[PDB]
Amino acid sequence: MNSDVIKGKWKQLTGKIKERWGDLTDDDLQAADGHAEYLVGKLQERYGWSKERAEQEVRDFSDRL
């Protein structure tokens, strides 16, 4: 039930993440770490939510996968 498929298809999902969250910079996504915790980091960097709120939206994107 718990698997980070985001880090696997990261450089592919980048465009879909930029589509999902327009405020997220593709260049910032297409960097390094990739895995879920990096989405949270960029969500904090760009937006600035609570990690729990970030988790929810990240898993929302994971649901779309």
Side-chain angles (χ1 to χ4, degrees):
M1 70 294 178
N2 180 273
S3 301
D4 191 313
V5 299
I6 307 177
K7 54 176 170 58
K9 295 289 180 174
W10 178 241
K11 194 175 181 181
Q12 181 265 90
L13 299 178
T14 44
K16 295 182 176 63
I17 298 177
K18 175 180 173 175
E19 179 252 47
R20 190 65 275 138
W21 298 296
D23 182 74
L24 290 184
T25 316
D26 177 86
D27 303 75
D28 279 73
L29 303 173
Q30 196 185 90
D33 296 78
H35 72 295
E37 286 293 85
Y38 192 70
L39 285 77
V40 177
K42 284 300 177 181
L43 293 176
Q44 298 302 90
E45 189 191 302
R46 282 304 313 159
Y47 301 94
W49 301 331
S50 50
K51 187 177 191 184
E52 179 178 58
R53 177 174 170 192
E55 287 183 56
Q56 187 63 212
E57 306 306 274
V58 173
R59 294 189 292 252
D60 172 88
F61 179 75
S62 304
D63 184 88
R64 187 182 183 194
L65 303 179

